[PDB]
């Protein structure tokens, strides 16, 4: 019948940069979770607050599918309560998160000889992100006392840096694609269920 567009998310051709991550809303359909966990094609697969086995027995009002690309040594920051540049400045998860975090290596897709410098990450911010914040401001960061007024310089850094994924890098520095499924059920009626 009307299946949930998970292929749209995991099998998409374009992935966003982590600082400007992309959120897909999923509702009014039936989702086969078994297609996900029954697969070792994934390198990380951790669910928080529910067990994936018990997923087909539950119904939700929304599933949000946030997806972005970071290097592999940072996938360990896509968890509740983690710290580091990715966790604090790009994608924060909340202390009480109910969802899953699925990642797989994509060196053969996101590396180009000489470097894929099209993937960015935020490096500076004056404060941590709030959970599920998404901050795309390109305002010059004042690291000193000099107001920077849209001009880079001494103590005046542009807050996004590039990744530069080369196919030769060690695995800690290869690009990984990440999807983060949130299983929210608000004060709506449950509209995202599993099969028979």
């Amino acid at each position, epitope marked *: 019948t009307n299946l949930c567009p998970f292929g749209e998310v995991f099998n998409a051709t374009r992935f966003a940069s982590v600082y400007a991550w992309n959120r897909k809303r999923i509702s009014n359909c039936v989702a086969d979770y078994s297609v996900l966990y029954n697969s070792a094609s994934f390198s990380t697969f*951790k669910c928080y*607050g*529910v067990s*994936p086995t018990k997923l087909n027995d539950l119904c939700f009002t929304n599933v949000y599918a946030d997806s972005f690309v970071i290097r592999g040594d940072e996938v360990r920051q896509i968890a509740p309560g983690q*710290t580091g540049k990715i966790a604090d400045y790009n994608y924060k998860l909340p*202390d009480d998160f109910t969802g899953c975090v699925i990642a797989w290596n994509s060196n053969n897709l996101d590396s180009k000889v000489g470097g894929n410098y099209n993937y960015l990450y935020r490096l500076f911010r004056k404060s941590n992100l709030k959970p599920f914040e998404r901050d795309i401001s390109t305002e010059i960061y004042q690291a000193g006392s000099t107001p920077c007024n849209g001009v880079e310089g001494f103590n005046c850094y542009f807050p996004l840096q590039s990744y530069g994924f080369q196919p030769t890098n060690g695995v800690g520095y290869q690009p990984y694609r990440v999807v983060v499924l949130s299983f929210e059920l608000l004060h709506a009626p449950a509209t995202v269920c599993g099969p028979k």
Partner: antibody
Amino acid sequence: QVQLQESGPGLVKPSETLSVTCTVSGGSISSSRYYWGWIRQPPGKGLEWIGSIYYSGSTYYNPSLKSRVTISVDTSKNQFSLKLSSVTAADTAVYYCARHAAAYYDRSGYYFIEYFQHWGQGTLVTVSS
Amino acid sequence: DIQMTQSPSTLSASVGDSVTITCRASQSISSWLAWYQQKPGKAPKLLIYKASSLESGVPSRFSGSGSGTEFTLTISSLQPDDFATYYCQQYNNYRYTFGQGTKLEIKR
């Protein structure tokens, strides 16, 4: 930032009951995906795990110390606390509370509570008269 | 019950030196090992988790490696701030046990 403060009696006396609590700041024990735990370290000696507890109440204890202790949570004050029974001279220590990393399920459904991610400053407790 | 043996017990070394501490696990513990540092009079600080991952804000000279039953922590270039006691801990299953601790003294 998450921080953790210990509160405890300066001393107790032999064969009595020892009690310490930990008041969590900058994050809420309620509904949070972390086990919260207690670790003791007698003076000059190494660390020993005592037990850890989820917000729900579910616990894990060190087998060697289970039965002399029970820890519990007051989700409403945002604190958890340890009660250690029939104290010996041995149990003189610094008592540490800690926040685990976020607990998760793997692809197959197996549960992991993880490592001690953050530590309190520790409260020394002397068994004495 | 898994029991951890850490060697050496103590350790003298000069600044700029490289030092490696060893943790042996009586049974396989996959990569579920963490390394903690404890400067005098403070709480332990997590250095390494999942055997080899470095916690944020920990110096880049700290590195851990190992899997199964033999693990190491390695301070690439000793610093005087690195005077501490180092403990390893297995977090496989729900029986948690530490090492006896390696005390690192600075030769001067």
